[PDB]
């Protein structure tokens, strides 16, 4: 069916402008469903999913800018105008920045911008800390169908669990599994080539920080790493979880209610 | 077992200096077995394989410079002196370049440098054609056990063929198969951060060119792309195959005999 489409219709019904959510390195946006309960029931909600999944013969984007332009066209087949509201997670945030750059430069209004715990890259000697991690990409997948993390992940395992827990992932075959790994390999080469342009909007970073003994200033200083690319306001909010666990029910509820608060 | 260890003993017997072959992006060096028939039977042959295979708990190298230092120590525990003979294929070639500068700067003698169809990277907009391709990494594996290609590849298939055709790949589990995809993901983020230093040694490039209507000057011009990193001589030789097919019997015979000829 339409499991692996580039445009993922989580909820088309709705009066108010839609919120577009772009995938992490992994490339699937089904994980963003966890916001639906907490963002306005009058809000459409669209996932954006990597090329190379629905079609493994497809030439993957070779730049985040190319990827972003792909996704702007999709969200604009949904939304012709209005304030486009963007959410990303890890590489997604790198994508919505380019998109909002692209929209702003072409006269479109960019509204809400929500970045999920992703910070700028030294393309000099790229940090593994801030570069996409396969096990996290797996942990994000497992969380989507609520696997109990208290039991070194592998694709075959994540698959059967997904294949079983949600039967629109049944018929996700050994082809797709490799296209998942192929798409994720591309994410990392998209890190450390991408140089965000300055963005004249306000943005909202969700800081994933499970250590409550971490001083608040480091949370502001971490988020302020975006200052060469934002001349608007840089607002930030912390969920109490590690990077791959942000769509778990607690952070997803904190995140989703925070998205609604502003979109209202 | 010893299947996925960093130092792969393809042949330990031999009084003459050993040849060290570093893996492609895929990370496995078993494919270099196909030279054994054509390099002198008095020549040790060692494979160098990626960390994170034998142990998927390992922290991968974050730079080719670091990976190269890992492998230099490995090849130095085999040969402590003499002229160090390096072969690489795609990403491996980038790695033997780094090792060679690392040896040269510490007074070691570098001898034979054989680079298999890999050319330097624009780190600003890295070309996907000179970046490692997942399907190519799988075709390299299929070839190792001589799969007849006249039939969009997936990991689970490549593994079963390896599992059957060669029983030292039995017990190659779903963990390792993911560890392969994880190792290959690291390969591409290792491209485009690697800035080779100048190398005062002679290098020999094998140009993969399956199109014979291709003029000869363009093959010298292609190889000369290494000129900012080789102040010593740049010799080249063309096998009539594409990039992932370079260890098939025909090209492996040409390549192995060309290695012997020089080492004699």
Automatic annotation (TrEMBL), chains A, B:
This is Non-ribosomal peptide synthetase 4. It comes from Streptomyces sp. The lineage of its organism: Bacteria, Bacillati, Actinomycetota, Actinomycetes, Kitasatosporales.
């Amino acid at each position: 069916g339409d499991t692996l489409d580039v445009l993922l219709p989580l909820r088309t019904t709705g009066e108010k402008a839609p919120l577009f959510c772009v995938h992490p390195a992994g490339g699937l946006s089904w994980v963003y469903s966890g916001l639906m309960q907490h963002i306005g029931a009058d809000r459409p909600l669209y996932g954006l999913q990597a090329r190379g999944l629905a079609d493994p013969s497809a030439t993957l984007p070779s730049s985040i800018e190319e990827m972003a332009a792909d996704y702007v066209t999709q969200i604009r087949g949904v939304q012709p105008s209005g304030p486009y509201h963007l959410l990303g997670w890890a590489l997604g945030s790198l994508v919505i920045h380019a998109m909002a750059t692209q929209l702003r430069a072409e006269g479109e209004e960019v509204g809400l911008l929500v970045n999920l715990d992703q910070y700028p890259i030294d393309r000099s000697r790229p940090a593994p800390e801030s570069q996409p991690d396969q096990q996290d990409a797996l942990r994000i997948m497992l969380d989507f169908v609520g696997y109990d993390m208290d039991s070194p992940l592998d694709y075959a395992m994540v698959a059967d669990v997904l294949r079983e827990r949600q039967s629109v992932f049944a018929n996700l075959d050994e082809t797709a599994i490799t296209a998942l790994a192929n798409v994720f390999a591309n994410s990392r080469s998209l890190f450390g080539s991408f140089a965000p342009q300055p963005l004249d909007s306000d943005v909202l970073v969700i800081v994933a920080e499970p250590d409550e003994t971490v001083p608040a200033a480091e949370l502001a200083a971490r988020v302020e790493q975006w200052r060469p690319f934002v001349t608007g306001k840089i607002e930030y909010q912390t969920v109490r979880c590690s990077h791959p666990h942000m769509m778990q029910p607690e952070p997803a509820a904190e995140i989703g209610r925070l998205i609604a608060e502003k979109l209202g």
